[PDB]
Tab-separated table of N, CA and C and ligand atoms in Angstrom:
chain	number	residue	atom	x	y	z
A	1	UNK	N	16.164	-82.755	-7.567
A	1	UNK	CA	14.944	-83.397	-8.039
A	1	UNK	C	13.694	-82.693	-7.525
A	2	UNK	N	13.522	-82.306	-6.303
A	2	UNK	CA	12.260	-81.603	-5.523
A	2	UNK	C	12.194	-80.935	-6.151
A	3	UNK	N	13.134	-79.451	-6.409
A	3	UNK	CA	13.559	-78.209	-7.103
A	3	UNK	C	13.000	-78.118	-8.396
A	4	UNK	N	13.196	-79.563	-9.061
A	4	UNK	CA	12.933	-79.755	-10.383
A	4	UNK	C	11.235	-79.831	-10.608
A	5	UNK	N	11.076	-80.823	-9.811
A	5	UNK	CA	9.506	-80.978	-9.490
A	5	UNK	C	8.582	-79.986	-9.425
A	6	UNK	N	8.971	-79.126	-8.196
A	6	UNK	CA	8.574	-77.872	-8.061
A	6	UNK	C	8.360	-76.881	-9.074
A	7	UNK	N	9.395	-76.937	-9.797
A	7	UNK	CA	9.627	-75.863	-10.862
A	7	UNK	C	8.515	-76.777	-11.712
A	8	UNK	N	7.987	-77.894	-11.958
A	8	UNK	CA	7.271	-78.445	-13.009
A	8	UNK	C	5.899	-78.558	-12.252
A	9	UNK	N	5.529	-78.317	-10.963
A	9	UNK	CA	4.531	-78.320	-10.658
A	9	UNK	C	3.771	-76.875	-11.320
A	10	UNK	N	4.936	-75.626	-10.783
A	10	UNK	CA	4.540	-74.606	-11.033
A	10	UNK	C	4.370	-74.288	-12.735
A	11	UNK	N	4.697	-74.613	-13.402
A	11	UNK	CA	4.213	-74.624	-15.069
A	11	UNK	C	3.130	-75.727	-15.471
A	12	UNK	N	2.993	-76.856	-14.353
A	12	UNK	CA	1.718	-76.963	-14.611
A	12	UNK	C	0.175	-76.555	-14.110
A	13	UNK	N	0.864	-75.593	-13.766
A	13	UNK	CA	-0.349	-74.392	-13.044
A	13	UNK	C	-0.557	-73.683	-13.941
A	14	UNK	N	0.862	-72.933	-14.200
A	14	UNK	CA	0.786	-72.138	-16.012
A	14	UNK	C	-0.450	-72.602	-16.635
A	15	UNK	N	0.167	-73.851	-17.350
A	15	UNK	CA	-0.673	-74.614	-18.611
A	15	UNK	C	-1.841	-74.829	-18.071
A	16	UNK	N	-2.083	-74.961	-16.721
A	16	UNK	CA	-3.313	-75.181	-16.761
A	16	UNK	C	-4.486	-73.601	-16.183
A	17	UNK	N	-4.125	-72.622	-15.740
A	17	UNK	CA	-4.635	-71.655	-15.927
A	17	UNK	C	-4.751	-71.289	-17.284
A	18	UNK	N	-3.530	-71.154	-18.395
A	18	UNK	CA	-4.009	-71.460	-19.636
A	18	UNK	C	-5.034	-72.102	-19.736
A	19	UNK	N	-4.929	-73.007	-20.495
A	19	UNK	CA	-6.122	-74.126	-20.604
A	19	UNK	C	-7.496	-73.551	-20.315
A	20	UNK	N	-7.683	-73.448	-19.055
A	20	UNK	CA	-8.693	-72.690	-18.422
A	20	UNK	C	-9.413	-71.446	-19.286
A	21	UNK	N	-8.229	-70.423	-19.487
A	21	UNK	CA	-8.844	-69.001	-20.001
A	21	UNK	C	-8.949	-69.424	-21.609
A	22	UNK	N	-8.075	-70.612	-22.464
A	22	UNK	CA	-8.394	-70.862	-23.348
A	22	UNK	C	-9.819	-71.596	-23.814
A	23	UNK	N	-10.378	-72.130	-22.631
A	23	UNK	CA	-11.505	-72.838	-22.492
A	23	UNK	C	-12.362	-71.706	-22.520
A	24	UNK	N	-12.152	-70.862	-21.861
A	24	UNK	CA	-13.242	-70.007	-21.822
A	24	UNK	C	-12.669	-69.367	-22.905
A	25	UNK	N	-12.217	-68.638	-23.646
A	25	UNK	CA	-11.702	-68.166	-24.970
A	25	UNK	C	-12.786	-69.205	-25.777
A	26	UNK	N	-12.632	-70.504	-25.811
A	26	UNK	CA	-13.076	-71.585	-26.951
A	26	UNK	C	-14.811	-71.420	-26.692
A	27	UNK	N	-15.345	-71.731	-25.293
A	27	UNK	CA	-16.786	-71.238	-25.661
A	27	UNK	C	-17.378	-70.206	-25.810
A	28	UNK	N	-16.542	-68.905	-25.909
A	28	UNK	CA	-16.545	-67.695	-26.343
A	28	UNK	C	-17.105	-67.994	-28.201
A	29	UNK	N	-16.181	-68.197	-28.932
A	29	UNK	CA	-15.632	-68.779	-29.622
A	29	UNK	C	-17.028	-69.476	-30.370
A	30	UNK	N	-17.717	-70.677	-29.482
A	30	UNK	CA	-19.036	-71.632	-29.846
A	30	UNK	C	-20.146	-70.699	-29.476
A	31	UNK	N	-20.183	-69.682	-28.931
A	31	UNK	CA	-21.554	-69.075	-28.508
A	31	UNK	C	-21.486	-67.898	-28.988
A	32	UNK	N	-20.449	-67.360	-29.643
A	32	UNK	CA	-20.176	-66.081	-30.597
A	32	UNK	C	-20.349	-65.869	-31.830
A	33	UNK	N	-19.331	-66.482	-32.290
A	33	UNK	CA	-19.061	-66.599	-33.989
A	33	UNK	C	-19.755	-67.743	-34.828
A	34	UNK	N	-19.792	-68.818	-34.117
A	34	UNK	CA	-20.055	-70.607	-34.389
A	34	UNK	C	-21.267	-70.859	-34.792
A	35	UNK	N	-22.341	-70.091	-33.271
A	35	UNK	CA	-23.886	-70.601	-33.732
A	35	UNK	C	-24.188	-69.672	-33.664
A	36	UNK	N	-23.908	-67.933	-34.211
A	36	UNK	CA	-24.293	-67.641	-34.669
A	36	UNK	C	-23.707	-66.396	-35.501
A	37	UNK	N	-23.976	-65.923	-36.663
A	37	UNK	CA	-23.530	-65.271	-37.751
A	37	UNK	C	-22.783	-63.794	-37.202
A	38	UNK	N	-22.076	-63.626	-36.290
A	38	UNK	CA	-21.631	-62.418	-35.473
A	38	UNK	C	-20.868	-61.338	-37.028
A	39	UNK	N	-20.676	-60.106	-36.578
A	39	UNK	CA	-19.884	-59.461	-37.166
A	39	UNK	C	-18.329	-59.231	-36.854
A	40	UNK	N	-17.777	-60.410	-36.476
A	40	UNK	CA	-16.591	-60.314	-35.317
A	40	UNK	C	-15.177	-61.060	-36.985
A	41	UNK	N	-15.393	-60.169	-37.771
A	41	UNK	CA	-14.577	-60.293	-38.812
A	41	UNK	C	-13.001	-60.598	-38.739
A	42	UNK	N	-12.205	-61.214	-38.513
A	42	UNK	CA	-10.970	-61.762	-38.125
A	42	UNK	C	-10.988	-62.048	-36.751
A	43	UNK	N	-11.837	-62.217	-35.938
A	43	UNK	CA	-11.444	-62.493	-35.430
A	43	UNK	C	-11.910	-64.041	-34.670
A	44	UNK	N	-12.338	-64.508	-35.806
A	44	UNK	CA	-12.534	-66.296	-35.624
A	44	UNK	C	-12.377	-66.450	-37.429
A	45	UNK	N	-13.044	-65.847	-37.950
A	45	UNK	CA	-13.161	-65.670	-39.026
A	45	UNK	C	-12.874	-64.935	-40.138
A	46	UNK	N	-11.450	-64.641	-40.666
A	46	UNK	CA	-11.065	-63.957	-41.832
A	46	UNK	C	-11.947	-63.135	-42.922
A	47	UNK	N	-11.507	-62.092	-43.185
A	47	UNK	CA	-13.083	-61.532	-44.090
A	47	UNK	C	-13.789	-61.488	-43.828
A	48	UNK	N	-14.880	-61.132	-44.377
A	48	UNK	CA	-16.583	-61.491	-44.207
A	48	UNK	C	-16.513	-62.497	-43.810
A	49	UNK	N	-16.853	-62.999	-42.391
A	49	UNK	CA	-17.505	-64.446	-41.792
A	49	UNK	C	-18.758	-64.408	-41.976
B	1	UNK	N	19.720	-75.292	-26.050
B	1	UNK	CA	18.389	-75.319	-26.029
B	1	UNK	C	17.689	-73.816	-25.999
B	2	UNK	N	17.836	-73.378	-24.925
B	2	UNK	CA	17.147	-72.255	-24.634
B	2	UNK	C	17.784	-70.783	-25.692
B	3	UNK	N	18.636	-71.175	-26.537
B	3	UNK	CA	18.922	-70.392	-27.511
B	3	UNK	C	17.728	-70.563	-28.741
B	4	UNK	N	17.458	-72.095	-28.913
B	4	UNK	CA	16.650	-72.051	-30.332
B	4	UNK	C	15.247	-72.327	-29.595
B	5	UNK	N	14.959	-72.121	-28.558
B	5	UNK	CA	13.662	-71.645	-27.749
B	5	UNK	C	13.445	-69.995	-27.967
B	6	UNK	N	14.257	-68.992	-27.778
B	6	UNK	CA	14.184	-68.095	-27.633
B	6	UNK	C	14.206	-67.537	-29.103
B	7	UNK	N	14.808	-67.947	-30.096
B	7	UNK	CA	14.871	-68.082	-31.301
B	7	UNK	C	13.165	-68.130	-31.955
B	8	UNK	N	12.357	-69.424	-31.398
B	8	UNK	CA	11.325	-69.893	-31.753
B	8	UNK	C	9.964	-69.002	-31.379
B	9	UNK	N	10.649	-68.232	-29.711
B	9	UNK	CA	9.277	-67.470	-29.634
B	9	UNK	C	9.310	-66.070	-30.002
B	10	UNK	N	10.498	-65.778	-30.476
B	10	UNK	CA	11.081	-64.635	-31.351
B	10	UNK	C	10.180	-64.994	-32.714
B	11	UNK	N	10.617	-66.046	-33.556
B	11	UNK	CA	9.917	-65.751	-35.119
B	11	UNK	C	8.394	-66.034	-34.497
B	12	UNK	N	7.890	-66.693	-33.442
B	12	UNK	CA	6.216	-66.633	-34.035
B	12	UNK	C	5.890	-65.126	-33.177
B	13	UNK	N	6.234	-64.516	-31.974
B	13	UNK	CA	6.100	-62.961	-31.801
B	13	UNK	C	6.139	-62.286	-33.100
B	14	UNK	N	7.227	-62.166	-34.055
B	14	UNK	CA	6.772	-62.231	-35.401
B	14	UNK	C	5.744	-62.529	-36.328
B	15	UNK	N	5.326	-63.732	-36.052
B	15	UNK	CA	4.429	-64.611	-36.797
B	15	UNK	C	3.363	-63.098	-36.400
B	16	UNK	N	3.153	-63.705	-34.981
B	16	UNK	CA	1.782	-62.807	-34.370
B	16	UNK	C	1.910	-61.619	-34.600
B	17	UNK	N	2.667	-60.453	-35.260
B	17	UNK	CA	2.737	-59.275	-35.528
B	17	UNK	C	2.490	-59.296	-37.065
B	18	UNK	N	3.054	-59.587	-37.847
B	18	UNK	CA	2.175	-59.676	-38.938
B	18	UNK	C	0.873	-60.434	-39.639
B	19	UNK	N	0.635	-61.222	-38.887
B	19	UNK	CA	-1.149	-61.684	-38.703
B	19	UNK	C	-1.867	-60.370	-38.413
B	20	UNK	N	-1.292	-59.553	-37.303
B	20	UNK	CA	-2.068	-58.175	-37.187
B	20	UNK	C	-2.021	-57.152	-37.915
B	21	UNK	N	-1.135	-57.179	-38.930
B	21	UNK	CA	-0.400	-56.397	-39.762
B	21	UNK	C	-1.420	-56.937	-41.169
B	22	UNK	N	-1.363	-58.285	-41.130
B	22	UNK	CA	-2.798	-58.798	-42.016
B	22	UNK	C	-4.106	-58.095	-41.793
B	23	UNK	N	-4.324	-58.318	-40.544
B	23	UNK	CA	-5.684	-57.642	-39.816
B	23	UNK	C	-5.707	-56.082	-40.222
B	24	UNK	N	-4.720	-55.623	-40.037
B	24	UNK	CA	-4.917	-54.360	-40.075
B	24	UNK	C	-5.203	-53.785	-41.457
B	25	UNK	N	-4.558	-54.063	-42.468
B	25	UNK	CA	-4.153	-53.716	-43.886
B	25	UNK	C	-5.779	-54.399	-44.530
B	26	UNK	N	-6.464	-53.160	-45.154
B	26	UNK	CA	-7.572	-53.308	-45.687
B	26	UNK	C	-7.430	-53.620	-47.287
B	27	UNK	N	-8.552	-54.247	-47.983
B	27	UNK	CA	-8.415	-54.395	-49.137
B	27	UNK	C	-8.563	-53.038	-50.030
B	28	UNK	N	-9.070	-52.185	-49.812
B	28	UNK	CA	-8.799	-51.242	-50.262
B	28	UNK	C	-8.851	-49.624	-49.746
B	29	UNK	N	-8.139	-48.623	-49.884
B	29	UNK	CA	-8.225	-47.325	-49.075
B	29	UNK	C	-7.733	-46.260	-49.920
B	30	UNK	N	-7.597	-45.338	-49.554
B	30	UNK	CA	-7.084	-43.822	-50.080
B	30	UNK	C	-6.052	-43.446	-49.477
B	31	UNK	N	-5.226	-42.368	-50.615
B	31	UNK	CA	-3.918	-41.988	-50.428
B	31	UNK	C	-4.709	-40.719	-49.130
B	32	UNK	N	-3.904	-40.495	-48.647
B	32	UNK	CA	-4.111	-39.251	-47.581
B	32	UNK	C	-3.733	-37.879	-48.073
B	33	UNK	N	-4.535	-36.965	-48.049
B	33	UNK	CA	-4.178	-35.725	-48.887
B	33	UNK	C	-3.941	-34.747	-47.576
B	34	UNK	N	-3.341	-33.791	-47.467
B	34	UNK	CA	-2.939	-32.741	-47.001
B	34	UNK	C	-4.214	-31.647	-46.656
B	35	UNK	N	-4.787	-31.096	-45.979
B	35	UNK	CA	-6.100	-30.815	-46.121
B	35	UNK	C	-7.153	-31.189	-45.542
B	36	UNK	N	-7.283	-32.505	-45.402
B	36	UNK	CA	-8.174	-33.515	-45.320
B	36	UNK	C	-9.111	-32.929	-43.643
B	37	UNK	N	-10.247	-33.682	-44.499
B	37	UNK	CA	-11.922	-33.129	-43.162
B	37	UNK	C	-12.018	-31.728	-43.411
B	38	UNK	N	-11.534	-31.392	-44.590
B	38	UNK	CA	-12.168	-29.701	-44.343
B	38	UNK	C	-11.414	-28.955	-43.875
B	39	UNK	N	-12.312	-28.372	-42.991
B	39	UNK	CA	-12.243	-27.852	-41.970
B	39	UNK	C	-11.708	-27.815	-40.762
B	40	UNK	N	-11.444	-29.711	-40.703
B	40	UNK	CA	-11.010	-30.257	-39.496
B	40	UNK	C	-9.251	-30.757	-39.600
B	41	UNK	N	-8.416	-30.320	-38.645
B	41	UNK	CA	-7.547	-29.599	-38.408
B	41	UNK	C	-6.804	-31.180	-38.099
B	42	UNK	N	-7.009	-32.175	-38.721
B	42	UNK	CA	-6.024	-33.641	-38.196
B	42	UNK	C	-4.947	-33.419	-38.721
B	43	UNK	N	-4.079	-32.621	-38.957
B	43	UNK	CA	-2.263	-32.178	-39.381
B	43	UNK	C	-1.433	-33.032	-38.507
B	44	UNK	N	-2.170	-33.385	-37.777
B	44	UNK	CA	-1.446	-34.425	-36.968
B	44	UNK	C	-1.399	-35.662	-36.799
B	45	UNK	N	-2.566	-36.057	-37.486
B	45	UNK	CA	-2.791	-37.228	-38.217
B	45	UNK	C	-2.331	-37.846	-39.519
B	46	UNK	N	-1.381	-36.248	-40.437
B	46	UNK	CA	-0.851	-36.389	-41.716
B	46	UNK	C	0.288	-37.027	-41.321
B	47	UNK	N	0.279	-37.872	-42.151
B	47	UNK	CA	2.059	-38.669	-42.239
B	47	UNK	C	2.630	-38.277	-43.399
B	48	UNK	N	3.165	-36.606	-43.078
B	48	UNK	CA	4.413	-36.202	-43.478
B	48	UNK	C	5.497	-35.678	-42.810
C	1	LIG	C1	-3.576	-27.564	-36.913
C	1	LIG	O1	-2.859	-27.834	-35.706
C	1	LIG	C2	-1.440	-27.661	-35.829
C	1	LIG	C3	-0.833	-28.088	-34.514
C	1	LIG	O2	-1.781	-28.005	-33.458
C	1	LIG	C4	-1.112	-26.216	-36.205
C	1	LIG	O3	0.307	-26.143	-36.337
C	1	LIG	C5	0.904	-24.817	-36.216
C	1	LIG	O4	1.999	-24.765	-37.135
C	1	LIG	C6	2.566	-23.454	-37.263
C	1	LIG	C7	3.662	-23.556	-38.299
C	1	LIG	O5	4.881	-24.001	-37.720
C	1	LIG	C8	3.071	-22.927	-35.916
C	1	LIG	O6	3.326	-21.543	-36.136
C	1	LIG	C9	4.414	-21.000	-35.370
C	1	LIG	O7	3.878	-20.059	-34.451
C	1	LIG	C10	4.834	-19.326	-33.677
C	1	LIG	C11	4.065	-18.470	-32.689
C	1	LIG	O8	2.947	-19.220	-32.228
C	1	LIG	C12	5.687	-18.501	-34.643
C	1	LIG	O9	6.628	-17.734	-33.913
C	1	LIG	C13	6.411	-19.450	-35.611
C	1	LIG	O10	7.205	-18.700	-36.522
C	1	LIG	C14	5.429	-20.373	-36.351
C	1	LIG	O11	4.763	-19.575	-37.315
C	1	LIG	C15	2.028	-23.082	-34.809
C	1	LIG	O12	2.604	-22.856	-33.528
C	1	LIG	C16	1.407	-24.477	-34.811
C	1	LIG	N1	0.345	-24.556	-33.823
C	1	LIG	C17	0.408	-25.344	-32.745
C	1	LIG	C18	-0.776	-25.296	-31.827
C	1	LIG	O13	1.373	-26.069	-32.525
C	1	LIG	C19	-1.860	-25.830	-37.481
C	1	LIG	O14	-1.729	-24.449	-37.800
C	1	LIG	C20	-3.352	-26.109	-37.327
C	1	LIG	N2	-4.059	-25.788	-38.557
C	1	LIG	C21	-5.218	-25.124	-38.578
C	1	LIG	C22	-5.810	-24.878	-39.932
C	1	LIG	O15	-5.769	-24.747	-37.549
């Protein structure tokens, strides 16, 4: 059970360092492409964004 | 389990390779001629 725990503490470190760099990925994301008209073509936005 | 896990991050590694394979592939381009830049010597850039 500890072992088990452990092992689930440590993936929720994973997911949450994820989370984290996805957070910062996501206001990347709102301050890039979102508000304002970037040339960043696939890569929020397919085609001409 | 960990068979149709490994299964699952197999087809979207997939998935994610041809999304880039989307990305990559333009709507339109030219055949590549033999020659090509002149002057400039990309024979190694020919895919033959
Ligand atoms: C553009 O660059 C490529 C590669 O850098 C040049 O490829 C050349 O291809 C010829 C044909 O196989 C090679 O010639 C050989 O030379 C040896 C002596 O050097 C000779 O004994 C062989 O019978 C054969 O003729 C040549 O080595 C090769 N060059 C290199 C650097 O690998 C190509 O010629 C370049 N094109 C232009 C317009 O500069």
């Amino acid at each position: 059970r500890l072992t088990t725990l452990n092992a689930f503490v440590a993936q929720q470190l994973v997911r949450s360092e994820s989370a984290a760099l996805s957070a910062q990925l996501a206001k990347d994301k709102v301050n890039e492409c979102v508000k304002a008209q970037s040339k960043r073509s696939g890569f929020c936005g397919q085609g001409t964004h | 389990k960990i068979n149709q896990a490994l299964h699952g991050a197999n087809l979207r590694q997939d998935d994610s390779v041809r999304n880039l394979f989307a990305s990559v592939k333009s709507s339109q381009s030219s055949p590549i001629i033999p020659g090509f830049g002149g002057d400039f010597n990309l024979t190694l850039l020919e895919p033959v």
